[PDB]
Design a protein around this ligand. Sequence first.
Ligand SMILES: CC(=O)Oc1ccccc1C(=O)O
Ligand SMILES: [Ca+2]
Length: 119
Amino acid sequence: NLYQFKNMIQCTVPSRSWQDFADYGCYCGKGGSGTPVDDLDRCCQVHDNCYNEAENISGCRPYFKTYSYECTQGTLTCKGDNNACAASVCDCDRLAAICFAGAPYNDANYNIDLKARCN
Ligand SMILES: CC(=O)Oc1ccccc1C(=O)O
Ligand SMILES: [Ca+2]
């Protein structure tokens, strides 16, 4: 679920407030269309796409599904007790968190005008 995703972010990127990733580029946060503005936005595009794919699983709701995961000593793990939906969503989130940690953050791309620049 989003609360868990937020925690994954806090875990792999402890140097930025999680909010910094909540409204960035065309894909990070609410937005979900257009051309990704940079490598960080591409992380979010793939993440959004990953959620769309999981929604195909009957009864699978990525924003709300609680999965089983651990973040200890610099390592994020999705656990084995996850059903297909939970496993898929956990991996979507895990891969995005890792992606965020390796991507450059451009303050200029935070809170951009989605209606004008992302369609
Ligand atoms: C806005 C939202 O509900 O989810 C997110 C939180 C942090 C980063 C990205 C997103 C997203 O939906 O793309
Ligand atoms: Ca999005």
